[PDB]
Design an enzyme around this catalytic site. Structure first.
Site, PDB file in Angstrom:
ATOM      1  N   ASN A 113      57.339 -70.742  88.796  1.00 23.29           N
ATOM      2  CA  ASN A 113      57.429 -70.523  90.357  1.00 23.29           C
ATOM      3  C   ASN A 113      55.992 -70.610  90.768  1.00 23.29           C
ATOM      4  O   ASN A 113      55.440 -69.600  90.930  1.00 23.29           O
ATOM      5  CB  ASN A 113      57.759 -69.101  90.404  1.00 23.29           C
ATOM      6  CG  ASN A 113      59.406 -68.907  90.068  1.00 23.29           C
ATOM      7  OD1 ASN A 113      60.168 -69.618  89.712  1.00 23.29           O
ATOM      8  ND2 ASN A 113      59.679 -67.632  90.137  1.00 23.29           N
ATOM      9  N   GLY A 191      54.971 -63.499  81.179  1.00 23.15           N
ATOM     10  CA  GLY A 191      55.615 -63.164  79.935  1.00 23.15           C
ATOM     11  C   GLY A 191      54.505 -62.600  78.834  1.00 23.15           C
ATOM     12  O   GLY A 191      53.354 -62.583  79.275  1.00 23.15           O
ATOM     13  N   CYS A 242      63.669 -66.079  86.438  1.00 22.21           N
ATOM     14  CA  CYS A 242      63.746 -65.090  85.517  1.00 22.21           C
ATOM     15  C   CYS A 242      65.124 -64.371  85.914  1.00 22.21           C
ATOM     16  O   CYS A 242      65.533 -64.410  86.976  1.00 22.21           O
ATOM     17  CB  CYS A 242      62.615 -64.244  85.311  1.00 22.21           C
ATOM     18  SG  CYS A 242      62.591 -62.956  84.302  1.00 22.21           S
ATOM     19  N   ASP A 516      54.452  11.358  80.397  1.00 24.72           N
ATOM     20  CA  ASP A 516      54.142  10.137  79.790  1.00 24.72           C
ATOM     21  C   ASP A 516      55.471   9.559  79.181  1.00 24.72           C
ATOM     22  O   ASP A 516      55.499   9.462  77.869  1.00 24.72           O
ATOM     23  CB  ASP A 516      53.012  10.260  78.750  1.00 24.72           C
ATOM     24  CG  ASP A 516      51.594  10.099  79.148  1.00 24.72           C
ATOM     25  OD1 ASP A 516      51.486  10.240  80.653  1.00 24.72           O
ATOM     26  OD2 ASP A 516      50.751  10.112  78.651  1.00 24.72           O
ATOM     27  N   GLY A 543      55.415  12.491  89.162  1.00 28.87           N
ATOM     28  CA  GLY A 543      54.829  11.234  88.415  1.00 28.87           C
ATOM     29  C   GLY A 543      55.499  10.583  87.169  1.00 28.87           C
ATOM     30  O   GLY A 543      55.707   9.280  87.617  1.00 28.87           O
ATOM     31  N   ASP A 547      58.931   6.931  87.601  1.00 27.21           N
ATOM     32  CA  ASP A 547      58.740   5.678  86.506  1.00 27.21           C
ATOM     33  C   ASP A 547      60.077   5.623  85.663  1.00 27.21           C
ATOM     34  O   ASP A 547      60.663   4.716  85.370  1.00 27.21           O
ATOM     35  CB  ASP A 547      57.380   5.626  85.841  1.00 27.21           C
ATOM     36  CG  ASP A 547      56.404   5.777  86.772  1.00 27.21           C
ATOM     37  OD1 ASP A 547      56.615   5.357  87.819  1.00 27.21           O
ATOM     38  OD2 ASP A 547      55.279   6.110  86.259  1.00 27.21           O
ATOM     39  N   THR A 594      57.513  15.671  94.099  1.00 25.62           N
ATOM     40  CA  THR A 594      57.149  17.240  93.782  1.00 25.62           C
ATOM     41  C   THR A 594      55.601  17.386  93.530  1.00 25.62           C
ATOM     42  O   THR A 594      55.004  18.596  93.743  1.00 25.62           O
ATOM     43  CB  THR A 594      57.924  17.895  92.889  1.00 25.62           C
ATOM     44  OG1 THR A 594      57.868  17.191  91.575  1.00 25.62           O
ATOM     45  CG2 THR A 594      59.452  18.002  93.321  1.00 25.62           C
ATOM     46  N   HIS A 654      43.354   6.404  94.829  1.00 22.88           N
ATOM     47  CA  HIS A 654      44.316   5.243  95.263  1.00 22.88           C
ATOM     48  C   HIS A 654      43.787   4.650  96.905  1.00 22.88           C
ATOM     49  O   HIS A 654      43.707   3.535  96.883  1.00 22.88           O
ATOM     50  CB  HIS A 654      45.756   5.997  95.618  1.00 22.88           C
ATOM     51  CG  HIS A 654      46.257   6.227  94.095  1.00 22.88           C
ATOM     52  ND1 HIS A 654      47.350   7.044  94.105  1.00 22.88           N
ATOM     53  CD2 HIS A 654      46.025   5.557  93.011  1.00 22.88           C
ATOM     54  CE1 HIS A 654      47.883   7.088  92.820  1.00 22.88           C
ATOM     55  NE2 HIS A 654      47.153   5.951  92.076  1.00 22.88           N
ATOM     56  N   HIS A 734      46.099  11.934  84.474  1.00 25.13           N
ATOM     57  CA  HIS A 734      45.715  10.775  85.186  1.00 25.13           C
ATOM     58  C   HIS A 734      44.767  10.922  86.123  1.00 25.13           C
ATOM     59  O   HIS A 734      43.817  10.122  86.351  1.00 25.13           O
ATOM     60  CB  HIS A 734      47.182  10.058  85.804  1.00 25.13           C
ATOM     61  CG  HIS A 734      46.910   8.750  86.486  1.00 25.13           C
ATOM     62  ND1 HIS A 734      46.413   7.592  85.592  1.00 25.13           N
ATOM     63  CD2 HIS A 734      46.974   8.394  87.718  1.00 25.13           C
ATOM     64  CE1 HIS A 734      46.240   6.713  86.302  1.00 25.13           C
ATOM     65  NE2 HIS A 734      46.657   7.033  87.742  1.00 25.13           N
TER      66      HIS A 734
HETATM   67 FE   LIG Z   1      47.145   5.925  89.737  1.00 29.60          FE
END
Ligand SMILES: [Fe+3]
Lengths: 859, 265
Positions: A113, A191, A242, A516, A543, A547, A594, A654, A734
């Site tokens: 081409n 190519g 091609c 704990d 506490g 948890d 509490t 805190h 704590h």
């Molecule tokens: Fe704490």
């Protein structure tokens, strides 16, 4: 340009021209593109005749069609595409793309081409504001050169720089190697042998592969359409283009009709001897014959040694093998075609993959099928071929360069073959491959939030009302009360069970949670919950009970969850690897505190002891927020002295760490300030009398709740990262552990030149000293220079500690010196690798943490 | 007493796209009903929301025909019933949010507090910094609130002054109210302090001072929360001291008059 020095001078002048041309506006580039397209379109006929005369192959009419395509369709595709400046702009973010040009391009033109490829490449270079160098094939050089001129003059008649297209008059291997090593980007075609040199020159390159393309014909296909499309594509430009079909695989069911249709319209089927003659003619000494490309079927037959009718269009030879040894299974840019016999579709797929892997790996492949009912076969074909361009019911020569038979396909030459063929494009080369997109970034900030539990009831004696609300609006039927053994033995849960036993609620209690809490207790609670299947969960401990209840809730709603996966450290809460499961379908969570200073009734944290090694793992996610927070002074008027002091100091810590934290907004600021003031104002009175001062006890609970919200929305800092480990190692309370470290963390954070900062977008610079100054001003302390205020705050904290019966140092709590020293080295590493540490403004190191520990121990 | 706020409140500049991508496609909602006014719709202030809902797969319908009238509310409820949406987005602040809330009530409860949390999920996005109607009602309380300064950069001067004075008034009556507790007291005090510092800057420069605009937005939200949760001489003395307990009221009223003068009231 036939030597090195002139080539270097041409590169110099081309770089100078590109430097000027790179600053043109949109209108100038549009005008240049329009003029160049006009000229190239208007000069379509002579160029084809010149190319056919020089190269000695091809059909003049098909070359005219190719030039007209390479002008008109290329102009139409990118007629109104923006390639100048800002493209994408998102005002909410700070992103902006500019799309700068690329530079000088070294373009390689093949001999199949000559003119159309040169026109296409020059046009796409001019549109993109790049310079270009054309390195013509030695067989077609002159013709290609002429094409470039037909554009260049037109370009400089619209305003383009004079030397913006360049070419090499006499090409050679050393000249081509040198010119490839100089240009920024190489656009190769032709190519193997040239693409390898393009990709092994030290500069980015864009090459193309080539080879066999298989055409599949199955039972449910339009025979006339398939046969005529194959003939059209194969005969277009004598197959010298091609991507033209090199072999067709026809199933057994329609072999006869396909063969009849092929022979009806000008095809010559070869017998054994003629097939062998064509084998010997096509590939000589293991290479493609250069006297066969672009020739007619009659010419090929005459070269082979037999005669065919002058109207013959295609020579078809039926073969059986698809290996390398089969000469009919190789690429051939001529009207010679091979046809295979297949039993079922899977055999056709196997032959097609074996024929495309050995030859045109990554190039085109075509299938003819009824895409209405044979949907599974089409998907099987699609998910099998290592083919960048898969065609359905389309001639391959006009389908590979796709704007004629299919749309939304990029119209262009230079067919990329992707990583399979050793290329890096895997798409039709357009203008977006000639651009350098550069992005502009602006400083944003992380999104913040304010998340609190709903229905927070704040009044003395309000537990009856909020518990009676449970039946009217919600109407629950089962209740599970999670507490500790101490309050259960002393009858602290009597009002709740009395209220529930009044009406139709069946309730069960679990009181085997020690201080704990361990994960084994969590498993026991989850097992009991599963056995009883409750509808509500109530935690009536200060506490540890909250948890414990939270972890039993998690293990009860999702028994398959894993603790170690769920207790991983992260950097961003919304980008964590582990996503907490939704918890709203089984049970309703209610928290009744509490002990004042825990704040767990409104916060998403929960600490659990492993019991395997003894490490208190904290885990946090907003899915742990209770659906109901009931705070009442009635159950908090009988706390001891030491417990009250520890809770008060923990709440104060805190609030302080929530105010100082990097994630601080106006919400947590106001809450923390109010909590800080109310804690200093009322804590001693609550500690001293306790039962005889209801007002102080209520105020302490209110302050604890405010601080709980404050650090629930703004995470804590390094003081807890130290206190957790300190209280886990030596069984310290704590609150006591928090009390012994706050006055040192205050000094640690207040530094105008810290070693490290907290790498948060809204934390621009060290500002902790000013925050502590605001705290001191609000609490009611005097000073000057923003330094005496922090010292007076530290003195006030020390006096508050002295007032509530907390000792001065670690050594005052009977801690062995040798034991402390032997485990400090291992405790520092655990303190650093904590979730809270990542939120502190200063981001402490190991040695600084060790020094803080030593200062705390030795006073 | 109690303390009730929407489930999620998202506050930062440029937080509108992230607050939608990270949650709306997560919840799997598929239909959205935007409710705005003529002015915002014509100026194109709803374009970012529809553009975001276009990137992900949610179909959205806009109702921009709305002081509101009950006839407009009934028309919006009928349009919602015809469209049958799942997510309701209210943009504009003030009249638009009240109208959208009434439409939500009538669409989820055509019998006409009943419980309305079944058919629709309500989201409020304010474009004014005076009303704080995204956090105030208790069954009318929106499920989510998105506060960003980008939607409020180009407010006019008179509207800015009126909104600031309205937020100040809300904070003052929230602090003075008989039902006020520690939470509302702290929120109101913070809101008043932020209003007495950034309102002149927002009224003078306008969009040229984005910090003042963001602070005004935050103060409006805090005042709205305080007003929602809380519908005397010592109270005013404490407010004045934060900014013989008898002259302090005079100083506070003089400061209020000075602020009103500074914004051209
Ligand atoms: Fe704490």
């Amino acid at each position: 340009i036939d030597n090195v020095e002139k080539l270097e001078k041409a590169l110099k002048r081309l770089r100078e021209a590109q430097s000027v041309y790179a600053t043109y506006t949109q209108e100038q580039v549009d005008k240049i593109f329009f003029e160049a397209a006009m000229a190239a379109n208007k000069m379509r006929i002579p160029l084809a005749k010149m190319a056919v005369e020089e190269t000695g192959m091809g059909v003049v009419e098909d070359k005219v069609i190719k030039n007209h395509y390479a002008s008109e369709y290329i102009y139409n595709a990118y007629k109104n595409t923006k390639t100048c400046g800002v493209i994408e702009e998102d005002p909410a973010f700070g992103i902006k793309k500019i799309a700068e040009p690329l530079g000088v391009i070294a373009a390689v033109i093949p001999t199949t081409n000559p003119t159309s490829t040169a026109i296409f490449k020059t046009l796409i270079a001019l549109k993109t504001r790049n310079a270009i160098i054309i390195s013509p094939h030695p067989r077609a050089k002159n013709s290609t050169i002429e094409a470039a001129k037909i554009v260049l003059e037109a370009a400089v008649k619209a305003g383009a720089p004079e030397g913006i297209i360049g070419w090499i008059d006499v090409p050679s291997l050393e000249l081509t190697n040198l010119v490839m090593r100089e240009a920024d980007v190489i656009l190769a075609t032709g190519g193997p042998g040239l693409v390898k040199a393009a990709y092994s020159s030290g500069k980015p390159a864009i090459g193309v592969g080539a080879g066999n393309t298989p055409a599949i014909i199955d039972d449910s296909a339009d025979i006339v359409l398939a046969v005529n499309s194959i003939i059209h594509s194969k005969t277009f430009d004598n197959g010298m283009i091609c991507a033209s079909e090199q072999s067709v695989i026809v199933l057994d069911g329609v072999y006869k009709e396909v063969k009849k249709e092929f022979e009806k319209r000008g095809c010559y089927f070869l017998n054994e001897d003629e097939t062998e003659k064509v084998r010997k003619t096509i590939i000589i000494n293991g290479a493609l014959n250069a006297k066969i490309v672009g020739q007619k079927a009659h010419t090929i037959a005459n070269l082979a040694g037999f005669e065919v009718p002058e109207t013959t269009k295609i020579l078809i030879g039926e073969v059986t093998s698809v290996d390398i040894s089969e000469e009919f299974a190789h690429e051939k840019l001529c009207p010679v075609l091979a046809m295979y016999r297949a039993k079922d579709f899977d055999d056709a797929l196997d032959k097609a993959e074996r024929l495309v892997a050995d030859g045109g790996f990554g190039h085109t492949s075509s299938l003819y099928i009824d895409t209405v009912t044979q949907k599974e076969k089409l998907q099987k074909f699609s998910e099998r071929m290592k083919t960048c361009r898969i065609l359905v019911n389309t001639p391959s020569s006009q389908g590979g360069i796709g704007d004629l038979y299919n749309f939304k396909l990029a119209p262009s030459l230079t067919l990329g073959c992707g990583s399979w063929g050793g290329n890096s494009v895997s798409d039709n080369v357009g203008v977006k491959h000639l651009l350098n997109i550069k992005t502009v970034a602006e400083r944003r900030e992380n999104m913040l939030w304010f998340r609190t539990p709903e229905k927070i009831y704040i009044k003395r004696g309000c537990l009856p009302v909020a518990l009676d609300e449970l039946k009217n609006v919600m109407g629950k039927k089962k209740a599970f009360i999670v507490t500790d053994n101490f309050l259960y033995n002393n009858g602290y849960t009597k009002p709740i069970t009395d209220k529930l036993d009044e009406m139709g609620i069946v309730h069960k209690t679990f009181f085997d949670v020690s201080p704990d809490p361990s994960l084994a207790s969590a498993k026991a609670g989850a097992a009991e919950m599963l056995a009883f299947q409750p509808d509500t969960i109530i935690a009536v401990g200060g506490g540890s009970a909250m948890d414990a209840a939270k972890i039993m809730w998690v293990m009860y709603e999702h028994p398959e969850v894993d603790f170690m996966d769920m207790a991983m450290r992260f950097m961003d809460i919304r980008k964590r690897v582990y996503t907490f499961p939704k918890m709203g379908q089984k049970a309703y969570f209610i928290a009744i505190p509490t002990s004042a200073g825990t704040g767990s009734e409104v916060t998403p944290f929960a600490v659990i002891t492993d019991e395997k090694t003894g490490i208190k793992y904290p885990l946090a996610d907003y899915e742990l927020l209770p659906d109901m927070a009931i705070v009442d002074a009635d159950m908090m008027m009988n706390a001891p002295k030491g417990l009250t002091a520890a809770s008060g100091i923990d709440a104060l810590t805190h609030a302080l760490e929530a105010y100082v934290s990097m994630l601080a907004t106006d919400y947590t600021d106001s809450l923390a300030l109010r909590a800080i003031k109310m804690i200093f104002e009322y804590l001693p009175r609550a500690y001293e009398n306790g039962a005889s001062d209801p007002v102080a006890r209520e105020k302490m609970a209110n302050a604890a709740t405010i601080a709980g919200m404050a650090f629930a929305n703004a995470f804590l800092g390094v003081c807890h990262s130290m206190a957790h480990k300190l209280g886990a190692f030596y069984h310290l309370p704590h609150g006591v552990a928090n009390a012994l470290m706050i006055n040192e963390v205050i000094r640690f954070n207040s530094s105008e030149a810290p070693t490290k900062m907290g790498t948060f977008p809204q934390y621009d610079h060290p500002r902790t000293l000013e925050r502590y100054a605001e705290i001191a001003d609000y609490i009611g302390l005097k000073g000057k220079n923003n330094e005496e205020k922090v010292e007076n705050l530290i003195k006030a904290i020390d006096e508050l500690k002295e007032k509530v019966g907390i000792r001065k140092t670690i050594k005052d709590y009977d801690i062995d010196e040798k034991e402390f020293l032997d485990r400090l080295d291992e405790m520092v590493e655990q303190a650093f690798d904590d979730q809270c540490t990542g939120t502190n403004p200063r981001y402490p190191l190991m040695n600084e943490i060790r020094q803080m520990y030593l200062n705390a121990y030795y006073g």
